[PDB]
């Protein structure tokens, strides 16, 4: 909304024309997301400690290092607020994709907040029953996918982009809804899965958001889209602001959510970011790039399901713990080591995904 | 009178593994009490006791999956001497308590070194199928303090 | 009905198979996904590692200049 | 000499001033740069901070069914 | 080697013609540098254990967890060898700039190697005498600067790029040699200074290497250079390869140098990377981008200088420790917290520097 | 044989402040025996002792920079009282030891509070220039006990 005010004031002062450039809007959105996240961090942590534990106990080691008791499990509200404010400020409110991603973010954040509030405030070990959580996630994903399909019927907005073959560009019908459901729900769950360690979830998310920002910039321009043989989507331009806001919020949260994390992020934050990445991939028609760049998340899910299948079929488990990062931790690897090694893997995956984008 | 949730089962029992090793017994002359419907009783045994009458005699086979789960090596962890307290010598077989986030977990020494120790948290009843000869001596309602515990 | 080719069908099937493990997490309950025994082992490892830190020791007054 | 501009001299001086601290460190002996007492203080602070009061207590009970 | 080999082998198989493309060369440089670093890591670290301590050691249990004990120094040799191998394999050897970077990198690596050998093998705690160390640094830096000045003058090769003014591009004469000396030696010392924390130095170097890779790609193309209003340098194009190799080597070392580092960088690695960054910021005329993007190193050096100045002027000390990161560590911040927060700051500074390059 | 590196020297030292206040001393009947030439003695004393002979005597004043260095405020830190388990009570002047990465270092209690104590690692000889009267009792070759200490 702030961009419209700058455009209105352009008539009175030519200096406000800077506020309309894409690069300026993106950089300022990143900066404001980071600053708002940092500003809300210390106040949110203290307030959440009172809600979570009543007493605002000093966060210090070694308890905050190994057991991590006294650190508010509930979190990511700062991430959600920062992203929403940055997008609503430095992104055009009339762009359908901005609201298309914001609605998914807010819905997933609300479901995660219900779950975390039930688990922590009410001390219910069950928390929010998984049935209702997944039902709401599925209905939201199906609604957004149906809206996009209605807005993309007989349009390149329903095509699938093969990462290595430009000639393979099939046009999906109602199966577009199935693909959107699959990608959104799977990414949300996978990001939820990788919450077991400090800062292990906010990255890959930062690098993934940066890569999708670059792709959206490529997708948002006819010349670049034709050069890279990527589908041209007019409304995808504003998604760059959303991705930069995601990067800023992720950096601001990693300022606090890193070993020894002061505040975690439960279903809130993690599910919101997963849904945001899924809807961004759906909008950009780059689900394959989500799978490649987001290799860590899919690997986490594959490890969990492989462990479950090993338990079901054979008497010997494959991994020591269902998530691969927990499996490494139980093997003796310290938490920061696994966290930043997964960060390295994520950065390599993002670079490889951009390379493949360039191959076609 | 029959077993029901929130009622206390006074139990006389004999515990044997599939190999025939007698773990322990509670005779009718010295029964023992436990809640019903809370999982303190072995899960398989808790389901077996469901709805049985006072004085009923029955034999039930409880598998490893139904009692404490299967044995896992992940719960066997090395630990130095400095952790232990209040013991002159960390002789093998000694048992200590660790207050974990998931509640108390018994810790027993399986191997010992002059300055290093190896402990196992797995229950001795875990990882082996069990059979119980069981008689419900009496039934009563649980007290508020018992429910608190 | 969509427009498909055998190679395109195979690619779509491969993509759906690769994304399937992420989606199948829905049907697995928390108890089976996160075994209680393994979680207890994690907690015990964390608490023992916290306890395994290098503690202090009392010292006497003897010194060398 | 170089074909300087009156305005660019200020920028060049600013660049040299910003780069000076890195170069000026070459004349600071390691004794003042990093006293051994400082290393010991660092290590003692790290050791003291991570000290844990958790201890494994003995027990004896007959609660097993 | 490989580039010329593939260029010759094209006449046998046309598939090798792809190897000439810059993107493929950069990507394979990244991958090969990372793979070499990872492959040499575990075996190289074991060799240093015996050399530095006389016995191969491991934690072997809860004891010495998050402990720096039993971790060799002089780990930068792996970085040096990986970077050199990647550059020689995938960088056009005919490019003079690549050879200048290699020469300065190897010289600083040798200086650091002799210093660390004095410190460890001979137990000379003071290490190499500062006089001779800085004499060799100055000799190599001045030789490279003088060679560059003779090879290029009265052309954009010696012009200064003001970070925000396009018209103000003074043509430096012999002052170019002085500026190159200052920047190279300052970067080397600052990156050497950053070794206070194990994982602090490498990641900012990786981010700066990526930024300089982007700048070199912009600098190596006529159209891009004209669009961004930056000097055109024909040989600057190949610097993308060396920057990508630096990124790969840094990530590979951080795989093992993560807190608790299995091996310290030492003077080797750190000093060589500082020299490489300085020579890259000299060859590319964007020294101000080195100042801004590498703001962490400049801030650390300024903090040390301010600490000594305050300790001289008065009996008080501005900081708990002369380096700022140690100051925060003594304040209560755990080492990984400072590590990751400084990484966040470095990434933000790199993005800001790219923004300044854009807005000119 | 003159005093040199790797030679054990029997020293009857006496330490005083610039004001003449006694800090520590040793008589000729019980001199300090340790290996010379490794920065073990205060560097000023080690430097001064070089070249002297059995039965030689001298007096020297040594600055802070050459003996235990200057005082460092970072070596004094707040610590909760719960850290010091194994002892009934704490009082100012009590001393403890810390096994520490990059060399163990001792600490002395400087203050006591309701829930916290303040301990300082600075040696009492640090931060002060000191005067050292010395008498050389005997000189001998290396011995392993001095290396063990």
Peptide bond into E133 cis (omega under 30): no
Can you read off the two tokens belonging to residue A328? 């490494």
d(CA A18, CA A162): 37
Helix (H) or strand (E) holding F10: strand F7-17
In 3-state terms, what secondary structure has residue F13?
strand
Strand order in the sheet with F95-98: C56-58, F95-98, F105-112, F116-120, F76-80
A185-224 core/surface letters (b: 16 or more CB in 10 A; e: else): bbbbbbbbbbbbbbbbbbbbbbbbbbbbbebbbbbbbeee
d(CA E98, CA C26): 53
Please state, in angstroms and as integers, the Cα–Cα distance from residue E350 to each residue in A320, E163, E194, E211, following that order: 40, 14, 17, 7
CB within 8 Å: F87 and C54:
no
B74-93 core/surface letters (b: 16 or more CB in 10 A; e: else): bbbbbbbebbbeeeeebeee
| F89 class by beta-carbon count within 10 Å (0-12 exposed, 13-18 middle, 19+ buried) | exposed
d(CA C50, CA E174): 60
Per residue, the 3-state secondary structure of chain B, as one string, reads CECCCCEEEEEEEEEEECCCCEEEEECCCCCEEEECCCCCCCHHHHHHCCCCECCCEEEEEECHHHCCCCCCHHHEEEEEHHHECCCCCCCCCCEEEEEECCEEEEEEEEEECCCEEEEECCCCCCCCCEEEEEEEEEEEECCHHHHHC
Can you read off the two tokens belonging to residue A49? 């400690």
> What Rg do the C-alpha atoms of chain D give, in angstroms?
29
F78 touches chain D (CB under 8 A): no
Q: How many beta carbons lie within 10 A of that of residue F17, not counting itself?
A: 13
Closest CA of chain E from D57, distance in Å: 19
The dihedral over CA atoms of E346, E347, E349, E354, expressed in degrees to the nearest 10, equals 140
Q: Are E267 and E174 in contact (CB under 8 A)?
A: no
d(CA A26, CA A241): 5
Q: Residue D43: closest CA among chain C residues belongs to which residue?
A: C54
Find the chain F residues whose C-beta atoms sit closer than 8 A to any C-beta of E. Answer: 74, 101-102
E218 Cβ neighbours under 8 A, 6+ residues apart? E224, E225, E228, E230, E357
Can you read off the two tokens belonging to residue A311? 């338990």
In sequence order, the β-bridge partners of residue B109 are B119
D42 Cβ neighbours under 8 A, 6+ residues apart? E321, E326, E329, E330, F74
Identify the sign of the CA torsion E284, E290, E293, E297. positive
Give the residue among D37, D59, E209, A330 at the shortest CA–CA distance from F74.
Answer: D37
Give the residue among A279, A183, A169 at the shortest CA–CA distance from A229.
Answer: A169
Closest CA of chain C from F1, distance in Å: 23
**Which A-chain residues 9-68 have CB contacts (< 8 A) with chain D?**
60-63, 65
d(CA A89, CA A92): 8
d(CA B30, CA F116): 51
Q: Are B139 and B8 in contact (CB under 8 A)?
A: yes
Query: What does chain A come to in residues?
Result: 360
Q: How many beta carbons lie within 10 A of that of residue A137, not counting itself?
A: 24
Q: Are F101 and E69 in contact (CB under 8 A)?
A: yes
F77 touches chain D (CB under 8 A): yes
Give residue for tokens 């137990």.
E123
Give residue for tokens 């009496």.
B138
Q: Residue E60: closest CA among chain B residues belongs to which residue?
A: B78
d(CA E358, CA E214): 12
d(CA E322, CA E319): 6
| Residue in C11, C18, C35 closest to A291 by CB | C18
Q: Nearest-5° angle of CA E186, CA E187, CA E188?
A: 90
In 3-state terms, what secondary structure has residue A161?
coil
| Long-range interactions of A325-328: CB distance < 8 A, separation 24+ | A325/A194, A325/A196, A325/A197, A325/A200, A325/A300, A326/A196, A326/A197, A326/C42, A327/A303
Given 3-state DSSP classes, what are the helix, strand and coil percentages for chain D, each rounded to the nearest 5?
A: 60, 5, 30
Mutate to test the interface with D, among E131, E155, E160 (most CBs of D within 10 A): E160
d(CA E273, CA E280): 10
d(CA E273, CA E212): 13
E112-135 core/surface letters (b: 16 or more CB in 10 A; e: else): bbbbbbbbbeeeeeebbeeeebbe
Find the chain B residues whose C-beta atoms sit closer than 8 A to any C-beta of E. Answer: 78-80, 116
Eight-state DSSP code of residue D25: G
d(CA E2, CA E17): 12
List chain E residues with CB under 8 Å of A358. 23
CB within 8 Å: F106 and C59:
yes
Give the residue among B145, B146, B143, B135 at the shortest CA–CA distance from B31.
Answer: B135
List chain D residues with CB under 8 Å of E130. 26, 29-30
In 3-state terms, what secondary structure has residue F138?
strand
Give residue for tokens 């207050």.
B99
CB within 8 Å: C47 and D55:
no
The dihedral over CA atoms of E142, E145, E148, E150, expressed in degrees to the nearest 10, equals -60
Give the residue among A105, A62, A41 at the shortest CA–CA distance from A245.
Answer: A105
List chain E residues with CB under 8 Å of B80. 61-63
d(CA E348, CA E352): 6
Give residue for tokens 């199966």.
A175
Give the residue among F126, F121, F129, F136 at the shortest CA–CA distance from F46.
Answer: F136
A128 Cβ neighbours under 8 A, 6+ residues apart? A111, A114, A115, A118, A119, A267
Please state, in angstroms and as integers, the Cα–Cα distance from residue E300 to each residue in E117, E191, F89, following that order: 26, 9, 43
Can you read off the two tokens belonging to residue E141? 């830096």
d(CA F62, CA F67): 7
Half-sphere exposure of E234 (CA within 13 A, CB side): 6
Resolution of the experimental structure, in angstroms: 3.4
E82 Cβ neighbours under 8 A, 6+ residues apart? E33, E36, E37, E40, E245, E248, E249, E252
Please state, in angstroms and as integers, the Cα–Cα distance from residue E53 to each residue in E56, E118, E256, following that order: 8, 14, 18
Closest CA of chain F from C57, distance in Å: 5
d(CA A205, CA A247): 8
CB within 8 Å: F77 and D45:
yes
**Experimental technique for the deposited model:** cryo-EM
How far is Cα of residue E176 from the mean position of the Cα atoms in its chain?
Answer: 21
Give the residue among A353, A88, A350 at the shortest CA–CA distance from A238.
Answer: A88
> What Rg do the C-alpha atoms of chain B give, in angstroms?
18
Give the residue among E279, E241, E286, E287 at the shortest CA–CA distance from E103.
Answer: E279
DSSP F89-128: ---TT-EEEE--TTS-EEEEEEEE-SSEEEEE-S-TTTTS
F65 Cβ neighbours under 8 A, 6+ residues apart? none
Give residue for tokens 């396009």.
E166
Mutate to test the interface with D, among B42, B80, B98 (most CBs of D within 10 A): B98
B16 Cβ neighbours under 8 A, 6+ residues apart? B22, B23, B130, B131
Query: First and final CA of chain B: distance in angstroms?
Result: 24
Q: Which sequence spans correspond to the domains of chain A? A: 1-360
Closest CA of chain F from C64, distance in Å: 8
In sequence order, the β-bridge partners of residue A146 are none
Mutate to test the interface with E, among D22, D31, D34, D54 (most CBs of E within 10 A): D22
d(CA A25, CA A137): 31
Q: Please count the helices (runs of H) and the strands (runs of E) in chain D.
A: 3, 1
Please state, in angstroms and as integers, the Cα–Cα distance from residue B129 to each residue in B14, B44, B64, C14, F34, following that order: 14, 11, 5, 43, 67
CB within 8 Å: D50 and C47:
no
């Amino acid at each position: 909304m702030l961009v419209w005010l700058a455009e209105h004031l352009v008539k009175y002062y030519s200096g406000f024309n800077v506020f309309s450039y894409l690069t300026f809007r993106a950089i300022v959105s990143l900066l404001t997301a980071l600053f708002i996240s940092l500003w809300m961090g210390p106040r949110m942590i203290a307030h959440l400690q009172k809600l979570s534990f009543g007493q605002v106990v000093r966060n210090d080691g070694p308890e905050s290092h190994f057991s991590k008791r006294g650190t508010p499990t509930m979190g990511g509200i700062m991430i959600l607020t920062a992203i929403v404010i940055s997008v609503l400020l430095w992104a055009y409110p009339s762009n359908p994709y901005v609201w298309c991603v914001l609605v998914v973010l807010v819905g997933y954040g609300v479901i995660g907040f219900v779950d975390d509030y039930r688990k922590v405030v009410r001390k219910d070990t069950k928390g929010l029953i998984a049935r209702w959580k997944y039902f709401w996630m599925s209905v939201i994903a199906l609604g957004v996918a149906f809206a996009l399909y209605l807005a993309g019927k007989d349009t390149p907005a329903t095509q699938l982009v093969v990462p290595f073959f430009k000639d393979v560009m099939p046009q999906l019908g109602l199966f577009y809804i199935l693909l959107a459901y699959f990608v959104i729900v799977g990414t949300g769950n996978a990001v939820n899965l990788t919450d077991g360690l400090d800062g292990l979830a906010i990255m890959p998310t930062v690098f993934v958001a940066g890569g999708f920002a670059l792709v959206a910039w490529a997708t948002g321009n006819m010349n670049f889209a034709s050069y890279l043989h990527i589908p041209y989507l007019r409304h995808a331009g504003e998604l760059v602001i959303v991705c930069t806001a995601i990067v800023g919020a992720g950096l601001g949260f990693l300022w606090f959510n890193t070993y020894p994390a002061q505040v975690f992020m439960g279903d809130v934050g993690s599910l919101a970011l997963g849904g945001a990445l899924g809807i961004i991939a759906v909008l950009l028609r780059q689900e394959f790039l989500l799978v490649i760049m987001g290799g860590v998340f899919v690997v986490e899910t594959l490890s969990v399901i492989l462990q479950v299948g090993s338990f079901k079929l054979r008497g010997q488990r494959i991994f020591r713990m269902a998530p691969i990062h927990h499996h490494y931790e139980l093997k003796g690897w310290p938490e920061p080591r696994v966290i930043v090694r997964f960060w390295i893997i994520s950065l390599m995956l993002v670079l490889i995904g951009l390379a493949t984008l360039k191959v076609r | 009178m029959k077993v029901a949730k929130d009622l206390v089962v006074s139990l006389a029992y004999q515990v044997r593994t599939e190999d025939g090793v007698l773990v322990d017994e509670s005779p009718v002359s010295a029964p023992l009490d436990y809640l019903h419907g809370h999982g303190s009783l072995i899960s398989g045994l808790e389901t077996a006791l469901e709805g049985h009458e006072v004085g009923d005699k029955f034999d039930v086979a409880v598998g490893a999956n139904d009692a404490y789960g299967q044995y896992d090596e992940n719960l066997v962890q090395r630990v130095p001497k400095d952790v232990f307290m209040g013991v002159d010598e960390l002789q093998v077989g000694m048992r200590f308590l660790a207050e974990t986030d998931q509640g108390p977990v018994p810790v027993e020494i399986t191997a010992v070194e002059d300055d290093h120790v190896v402990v196992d948290g797995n229950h001795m009843l875990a990882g082996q199928n069990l059979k119980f000869n069981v008689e419900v001596v009496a039934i009563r309602e649980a007290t508020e303090e018992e429910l608190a515990h | 009905m969509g427009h498909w080719t055998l190679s395109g069908i195979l690619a779509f099937l491969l993509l759906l198979s690769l994304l399937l493990p992420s989606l199948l997490i829905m049907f697995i309950p928390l108890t089976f996904r996160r075994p209680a025994s393994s979680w207890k082992a994690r907690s015990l490892q964390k608490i023992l590692l916290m306890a395994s830190s290098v503690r202090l020791k009392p010292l006497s007054s003897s010194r060398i200049p």
